[PDB]
């Protein structure tokens, strides 16, 4: 009777920090999985935010639809969050061909390869970023996406910025 998987992650986070802080952006993934042979892909993406766009229009119902031509033609990913392909990869953690699904993820240890363009020490499970001695340049919008067996199952945006140039983000559906 059961089939598939379910994930939820509270798709709205905001974090305010001063320069030189050692804050940790941690997200709480909640999951229920069947069909024990599965593939997990916890991915952290980044996009710089422009203060000139007060409404940061995240067209959230684009990640689930894989080949919407209408999505990836906004002339650029300037201050609107289009398909995750237009964002830059920050962290990638892959649990490939994981078999022991019924319990804690500490039983299926996988790898976490991160592009060194950023610092961003990675932590447990690859579900959280630990920012160490942060410069002001790292301010922006970080997004967490989870691929289950190749399809997006949950996505939670988080706005990381200082007090000076802090911008709000409004999620939208469609387009």
């Amino acid at each position, epitope marked *: 009777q059961p089939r598939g998987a*379910e994930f*939820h992650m*509270w*798709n*709205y*986070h*905001s*974090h*305010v*920090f001063s320069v030189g802080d050692t*804050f*940790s*952006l*941690a997200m709480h993934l*909640q*999951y*229920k999985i069947h069909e024990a042979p599965f593939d997990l892909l916890l991915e952290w993406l980044y996009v710089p935010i422009d203060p000139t766009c007060q409404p940061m229009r995240l067209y959230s119902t684009c990640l689930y639809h894989p080949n919407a031509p209408q999505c990836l033609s906004h002339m650029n990913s300037g201050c609107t969050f289009t398909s995750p392909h237009l964002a830059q990869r920050v962290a990638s953690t892959v649990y490939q061909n994981c078999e022991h699904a019924d319990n804690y993820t500490a039983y299926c240890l996988g790898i976490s390869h991160m592009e060194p363009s950023f610092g961003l020490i990675l932590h447990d499970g690859g579900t959280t970023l630990k920012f160490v001695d942060t410069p002001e340049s790292l301010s922006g919008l970080y997004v967490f996406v989870v691929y289950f067996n190749g399809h997006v199952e949950a996505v939670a945006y*988080t706005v990381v910025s200082t007090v000076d140039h802090f911008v*709000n983000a*409004i999620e939208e559906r469609g387009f």
Partner: antibody
Amino acid sequence: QVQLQESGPGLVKPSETLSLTCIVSGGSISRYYWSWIRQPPGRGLEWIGNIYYTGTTNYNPSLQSRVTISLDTSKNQFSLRLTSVTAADTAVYYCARIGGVSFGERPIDYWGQGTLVTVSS
Amino acid sequence: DIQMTQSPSSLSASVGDRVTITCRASQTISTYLNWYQQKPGKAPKLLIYAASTLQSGVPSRFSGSGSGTDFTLTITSLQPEDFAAYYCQQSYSIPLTFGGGTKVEIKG
């Protein structure tokens, strides 16, 4: 079996900065969300915002530019600040915790005693 | 903002009657709402979480059911102590929002 107590002023003049401090006992602080909830005297109660133990502050967008939530884990407390309080903010303010570890389990389980905040001259 | 519609607004049933209250949402929120009981003057208490699970220390006459966009709270047999008001609150999407509330009055 945790308990929460509010220690904010009962009367605030209009166009001021309301400040409340919630003090927690029983647990420590750590692996739970901590939230504030507003309720007008007659209307249904509404959510204002919550905070994780490491920043990560989620805000109700209807009133976001005016609300700030801070954490005082060293003193086992968390504070709420609302600037430019209008007449509509007169309400009962509760501080509570959000927890649960299961697919759908994210309840507002343990609520605080709540305090009444009114604006007048 | 997911709108939560709670029905009915006010009801009156005698002692021991089966009380049913419905909660509807604008979008699918799978087993991600909770039912709370607020007695007058006191702070709201958690009755049901995960839309189907009983909070510890709650009498079994409170039952939660439903999923997706339709949920239901049931009091099996009313008691003179169940006179409070009831709210349904979603947790799937920020901002987490509450329902309009239902006033259960005893007519026994």
